Amino acid sequence: SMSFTNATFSQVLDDLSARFILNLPAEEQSSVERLCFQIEQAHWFYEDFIRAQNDQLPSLGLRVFSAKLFAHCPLLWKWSKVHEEAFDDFLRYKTRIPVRGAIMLDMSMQQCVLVKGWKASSGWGFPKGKIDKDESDVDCAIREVYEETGFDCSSRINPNEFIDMTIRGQNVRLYIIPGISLDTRFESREISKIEWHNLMDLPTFKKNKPMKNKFYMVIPFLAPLKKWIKKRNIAN
Amino acid sequence: SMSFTNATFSQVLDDLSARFILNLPAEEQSSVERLCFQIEQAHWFYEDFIRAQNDQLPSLGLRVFSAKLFAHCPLLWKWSKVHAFDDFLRYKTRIPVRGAIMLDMSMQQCVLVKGWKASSGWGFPKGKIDKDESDVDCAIREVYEETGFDCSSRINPNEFIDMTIRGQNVRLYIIPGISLDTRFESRTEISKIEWHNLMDLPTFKKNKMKNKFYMVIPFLAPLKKWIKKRNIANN
Amino acid sequence: MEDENILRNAVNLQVLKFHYPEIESIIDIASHVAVYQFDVGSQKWLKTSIEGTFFLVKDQRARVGYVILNRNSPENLYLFINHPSNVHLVDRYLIHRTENQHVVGLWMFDPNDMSRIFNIVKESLL
Amino acid sequence: MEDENILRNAVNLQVLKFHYPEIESIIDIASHVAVYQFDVGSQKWLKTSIEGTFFLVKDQRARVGYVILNRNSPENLYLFINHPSNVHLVDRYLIHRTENQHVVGLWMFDPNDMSRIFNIVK
Amino acid sequence: EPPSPSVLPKPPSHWVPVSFNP
Amino acid sequence: PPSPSVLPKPPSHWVPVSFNP
DSSP states (O other), rough: OOTTTTTOOHHHHHHHHHHTTTSSOHHHHHHHHHHHHHHHHHHHIIIIIHHHOTTTTTOOOOOHHHHHHHHOOGGGGGGGGHHHHHHHHHHOOOOEEEEEEEEEEEEESSSEEEOOOOOSOOBBBBBBEEETTOOOOHHHHHHHHHHHOOOOOOOOOOOOOOEEEEETTEEEEEEEEEEOOTTOOOOOOOEEEEEEEETTTSSSSSSSSSOOBSSOOHHHHHHHHHHHHHHHHHHO | TTTTOOOOOOHHHHHHHHHHHHTOOOOSSSSSSHHHHHHHHHHHHHHTGGSSSOOOOOOHHHHHHHHHHHHOOHHHHHHHHHHOOOHHHHHHHOEEEEEEEEEEESEEEEEEESSSSSOOOOOOOOOOOTTTOOOOHHHHHHHHHHOOOOOTTTTOOOOEEEEEEEEEEEEEEEEEEEEOOOOOOOOOEEEEEEEEETTTSSSTSSOOOOOOOOSSSGGGHHHHHHHEEEEEHOO | OOHHHHHHHHHHHHHHHHHHEEEEEEEEEEEEEEEEEEETTTTEEEEEEEEEEEEEEEEEEEEEEEEEESSSSOOOEEEEEOOOGGGGETTEEEEOOOTTEEEEEEEEEEEHHHHHHHHHHHHHOO | OOHHHHHHHHHHHHHHHHTTTTTTEEEEEEEEEEEEEEEETTTEEEEEEEEEEEEEEEEETTTTEEEEEEESSSSEEEEEOOOGGGGGETTTTTEOOOOTSSEEEEEEEHHHHHHHHHHHHH | OOOTSSSSSSOOOSOOOOOOOO | OOTTTSSSOOOOOTSSSSOOO
C-alpha cells in the first residue's frame, strides 16, 4: 500500500486510534487487559506496516508508543492518573508468549534467510516459533530453524548474540547466526519457500531507497541488526 | 465422467481411434515410433479411465488391445503396412518403473499417494528406475522417498505384478502385513499418503467418480487374485 | 455523556476521509466483522485476511458503501451497494454481490449489529 | 487417395455425435491444441489439463463451436462461438470469450492450423 | 473466533457463475 | 505444451477486475 507514505505522525495516531481503540464495545474499553491487547496490535501494526511506507516515522518502544497514543487521543484521556499508573504496570509487566528464532546471515553478512508460507497474505519472515513447555530459548530457536529451514544450527548458534523485541503481545528473541554458506540447501518438514534476501533490498534498511514485497515481523529488527553488523565489521 | 457408461466396445474403439490416431499430422503420421506411442496412450486411456465406468469391457494386454483397435479401423492397416512396426511393438524396450503395493495385516487396505495438483490422482508409490539400479532396490527407494516407510525388510523379490502400460514396464511388488499404525511422511511433490479400502476402489468388487486414480485400476484384477491365493493358503 | 460520541464520530470521519476523500458522512458502525469471499473456481467460501471495524458510509455522490479498516494489514475494504437485490441477510451473515460480480460474506461478531446494519441498508437504498 | 478422408471425417462425426448428439457437421480439424484459462482472482493465465484434437463443428442450431477430445482425461471441452468480435488472434495464440464470459486460450501445435482455423471462424 | 468458511450458507444460485463444461 | 507463463495478456474489455480495486 501507499496510504501512509505522506501521512504525518498525528494522522498516523488518528488512523491507529480509529482502527484499533476508539470503536471497541464498552466491555472491551473498560477492561485494562483488552485495552492492552488493542494497543499492542496497533503498535505492531505501526512498526511492521506504517514505518515501512515512511521511514521518517520513528521506531518506538511499546511503552513510549502507548504513552504518545494516550496523549494524542482526547477520549483516552478519560483514564485517570491512578488508572494509567496501573495500566502501564500491566503493559510493562504483562507476561507475553515467548517466541524464539534465528536471523541467519551469509559469510559477508549482507543477506539473510527468510521463509514464506503458502497463503498470498503470508509474508516473508524470519524462521521462528512459539516455545514449548520446559523448552529452553536456544533449544526453541534451534528446533524452529530445523523444522522450517532444515538447517542444523546447534553447532553455530551463540546464546549471547540475539535481538530481543516485544511486539504484538509476543516476546520475540532472534539469535544472530552469521557465516552461513550460500551453498546451503534448505528444506522443510508447511513452508512455501526458503530464500536469501539482500539486506539493503529489505524495507528501511538503506538510508533512502524505494520494491513491493510483503514481510511479517522483519522491519522492527533491521535497525538493531544493522547496528550489530556495523559492530562486527568494526571488530574485523 | 459418464460419457462411456453406455458405449459398446465398437463405440469405444471409435472414440479412441478419433481421440488418438486418426487426426495425427501427415509429418508424424508416417513415423512408427509416434504411431505406436499413440496406440499405447489409447490403451492406457482405455484401461485406466474407460474401464472404470460401467462396462463388460475386459482388461487387455497391450498387443491384444492393439490387435482389436487395429482390426476396427482400416486406415491403421493402410497406415501401418508399408512400414516392421509389429516387431517394434513386440520388442520395444520400454522404460522400467518400479513400485510397491502395501497391504495391511488383513489385506483389505492399500497405501496410495496423491500429488498436489487437482488433476493429480491417487496412485501406487512408484518411479522411474535409475541406471545400474536393481529392480528391488528401485522399489525400496521409491517407496521410502514417497511414503517415508522403509520396506526393505518385508519386500519379497518373487512376489510382484508386471504390467506393460503407457509405454512403461511397470512392476509393483506386493508387500502385505503393514501395520495400520504406520506414520507416513514424504521426503519429496507428494500431497498426501492414505490407506484406501480395496473394495472402495473402482472395479474391484463385482459391481462398480468421487476420487481420481492413476494406474491403479489395471492392477486390481491380478492383485485380487493374488490376495485370494494367500488367504486360501493361510485358511 | 453525549459529547464523547460527537468527538468519536469526528475523528472516525477524519480518518475515513484521509483514506477516501469522496466519503461524506458515517451512517453507522459495526465493532468487529470478518470478510469472506466466495471463489467461483473452488465453489466454496474462503476467509479473507481482512478483519476489523465496519463503517457504513455515504459519499459525495450520495452512494451508499462500506469501508472496513483492516486490523491485519494496510489493505482496507471499500465497496459500494447499488441495488437492494444485491444484499441478502442469510442466517447470521450478510452476503453482497459487489459491482464487479464478486460475492462477499460479512460476519458481525455482534449479532445485533447484523440486523441493525442490514435494515439501515434497506432503508438506505430506497 | 480421396476415400480415406471421407472415412476419416465419417468416423470423426460418429464419435462427436456420440458425445454430443446435437452436432451436425465438422467444419475443420486441428491436430494438437492446448487449453489455458484466465483466473479472475489470480489475474493470471493457468494451464488446463485438457489436450488433444480440436474439432471445429456446426450443430443443429447452425451455431459454430468446437469440441476438444481430451487425450488426458474423459472430460472433453465443448464451447460455442457466438460473435466474431468475441474471438481474437494473438501473434501465436487464440483467445476466446465464452458464453459465461470466461477467457480461454488455445495454442495450436501447427501454426498454419491456427491461421486457417481463425479465418474459417471469421 | 470467527467461524470457518464452511458454515457460511450457500449464495443465491444465479450469483454463482459456473466454471466450465461438466 | 508451453508453460502458461509465456502467454500474453488477454484483452482489457474482456478481462474482469479482481475483487478489491
